[model samples]
Target: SGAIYVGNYRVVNRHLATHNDWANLVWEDSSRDLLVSSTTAQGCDTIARCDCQTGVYYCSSRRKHYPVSFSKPSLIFVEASEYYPARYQSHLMLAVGHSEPGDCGGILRCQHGVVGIVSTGGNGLVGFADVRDLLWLDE
Candidate 1:
């Protein structure tokens, strides 16, 4: 089976003097799916799944499911403090408003079955990117 590509970003609420929020992304080639997991600073965890071929996303938290529809399938990240470099404005708003850390002051736009994982911590804002042309997984 093909390997999985993973990316992550961290957001700290220093401006709001709140907790830290963490986000993670995973791409599974075998399933052709993207999974996102978000953990609030309050320890609330949410998992979201998207089908790449169908472009349908299902998000779940606290036994609640939310269906999200995206006209365009794309993922992006932008600095919350700056507006000039914005690629997708709606993504920023969603992340800032929904993310657990409250005052993350930034956002990560994930689409096309791109999922995210969010958590809480004290570390400052950080970003990570990884891509592999070919990879193999052990069963």
Candidate 2:
């Protein structure tokens, strides 16, 4: 996993409900402000791959339709709470209601399958953007 940071001092227009929300960080330095926002790479380490499946935790696809593992730099998925769907009993959502700080941009995963990107949180639930709703796939 790896990372990049920008806008060191200012926190204007920061977005989200939990520790993991924000769009831009003001860029700056000792001598002068950089042309663009700033950050680094050792900030990063090894690497990881993923899947886009939105299957629920106990679904059959988890056993026969999966491969590899889920990992990302500066991000983690530790199952702490369950995602309650609005209606369907068999459907699910990816969430981390009890995760640590700095998880806003983290990838929400179920093994190799990625369901969402960490977003806001409320009432003990860390919400996210489901990849399926992203109009990113037809498979």
Candidate 3:
């Protein structure tokens, strides 16, 4: 598996300051399959995932106050999104699921059955890139 580290984001918009927003950075592999990842670095550990096809975050991991694994580990699907319409500009959804004291991870499965995983920094929402154009054209 390949990896990259991202952080130190700039908050340039008013809507982003007080809202629960997510920022993401994505990479396309050799097969035209996308390997997407995100991090919530400032608030909570949450990540988002999406392939080129189906656009929904599938799995999430967070610190469980009462873990089923007895390791305080929990995996759950806690977020979703639609086409993320491009009205005037693009939108960037950050990764989520990790708690402040605990790291987390997630995976998203596209309609084509291509699966990808949250590879790093599974703690709170972090950086973002303009992916709205990509998603728009892909659709």
Candidate 4:
């Protein structure tokens, strides 16, 4: 029924490069449907989404970053869907100053009983269905 963000920021570039890790934004509705987003920026101005069941966050953004100052912040957003079996649960809308890992960082998490990953052979994230039943199907 609400969205939340959890992460850290740094005063200096070196400090940020080392300690400024990524964080995820989670959104859930009354229908058991959920969304998630991730970022390294202090204030994620750019909004995105990921699935609680699938863990995929998607974005289409137009925002700028000024890393040296850390004054300009980024903001991400998450919302409930009116449709069932939603197509995209999140969005990675912008890219800020480069991080040690890359210019854009994804919110990495494994909570909420969902499994996700940055897709191979392309950009963006992906989540998979529960495998516990599949393991038993072979029995």
Q: Which candidate gets the maximum TM-score versus the true structure?
A: 2
- State the displacement of the C-alpha of residue 56, model 4, in Å, after optimal TM-score superposition: 30
Candidate 4 stretches greater than 4 Å from native: 8-31, 42-81, 85-139
TM-score of 2: 0.29
**What TM-score does model 4 achieve against the real structure?**
0.16
Tell me how candidate 1 scores on lDDT: 0.24
Q: For residues 1-139, what per-residue lDDT tens digits would candidate 1 score against the true structure?
A: 0112232322222222212221232222212112222232232222224332212222222222233322232334443342133333221112111222422222222353233222221243222111111121110
Superior candidate under TM-score, 2 versus 4: 2
Better of 2 and 3 by lDDT: 2
Ranking by TM-score: 2, 1, 3, 4
User: Which number leads on lDDT?
Assistant: 2
User: What are the Cα lDDT values of the candidates?
Assistant: 0.24, 0.29, 0.27, 0.24
Per-candidate TM-score against the hidden true structure: 0.22, 0.29, 0.22, 0.16
- Provide the global lDDT of candidate 3 against the true structure: 0.27
Kindly report which residue stretches of model 3 are placed more than 4 angstroms away from their true locations once superposed.
1-54, 60-105, 126-139
Q: Any idea how many clashes model 2 has?
A: 8
lDDT score at residue 74, model 2, on the 0-100 scale: 21
lDDT of 3 by residue, 80-132 (tens): 22322223222333444332211212333334431323322234432122222
Q: Over the stretch 13-41, how does candidate 4's per-residue lDDT look in tens digits?
A: 11122222223322222121223343554
Candidate 1's C-alpha runs over 4 A off are 1-63, 75-77, 81-139
Return the lDDT, model 2, position 56: 27
